[PDB]
Design a protein around this ligand. Sequence first.
Ligand SMILES: CCCCCCCCC(=O)NCCCCCCCC(N)=O
Length: 336
Amino acid sequence: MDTSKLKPNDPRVKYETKQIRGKTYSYILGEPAGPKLETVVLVHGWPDMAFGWRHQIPYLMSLGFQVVAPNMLGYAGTDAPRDLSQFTLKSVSADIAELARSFVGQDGQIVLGGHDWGGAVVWRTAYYHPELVKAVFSVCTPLHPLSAEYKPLEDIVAAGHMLNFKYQLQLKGPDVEARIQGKDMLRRFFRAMFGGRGPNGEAGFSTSDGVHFDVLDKIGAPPLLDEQELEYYVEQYALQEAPELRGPLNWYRTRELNAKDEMDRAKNGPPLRFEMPALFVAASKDNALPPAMSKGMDAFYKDLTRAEVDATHWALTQAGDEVNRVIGEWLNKALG
Ligand SMILES: CCCCCCCCC(=O)NCCCCCCCC(N)=O
């Protein structure tokens, strides 16, 4: 079995859809080499897609795992509902549970893995659906406690707090959705998000201000995507109806809806408490999700393995071989 990363439209995997909780979900499905050990479900974040797991998918297949990597709500071939309540962490966790059980049966279990917003999804999925999740891991995204209060992010950052998330104000508003439309702008956006730079070192993205629109036309080739990977992201994002980023950006519009869900759990539901084997892979150079943010995370876990790779936010690809090894060795211990 060939273990190198997926290429665009790689024939080693299948590309399918299923109706899941009223929505069409598209996904990558890779079948195990050998008798199946487990089914692994992998969950990307923003602005990624299932292909963001292209280093992990064939690796995990070669280890004996069936792999299901959906394009998440809003992305590529998956529906983008207009109703923001579909985008909450609880509703998307329920989508993941139904999709998982459509492969493993209602009584089955999965290994669950996430990155970025997907990392937040998978911790919530393990909390909402402990019947289903046998082991869970996240790259970059630490646990965050159940919301006990709702405060507008504008007020939080105006008091000088959570300043690494201030870019979420721009993303939640109209500017990015209105300006990044069509394949020409999508192409410049992805050159920016995957590290391309301008003639005087201009960056296309900052955690303080979000997308730097006025440098996008000067951004050069991204070091973290090759030319056909970049065009694949453009083509797949162009599957969404214009404005193409409405779906992905809806992940920034749910702070109040998620707070409503989680204030109820903070007062009446069970505590945030993970009894199943868990792994957290921090990324040293992620400015949006810095390792120090994982502070007192260990207190919420019976069995948390920690790792840290020296990589940017795009650790799944930039450090794909290292992340694969960390996951495989942890999974081997967790399952054995
Ligand atoms: C822990 C609190 C709850 C989870 C919050 C997760 C926030 C996810 C998110 O907003 N990710 C977007 C980052 C932007 C990529 C940066 C590209 C530029 C580059 N790295 O080259």
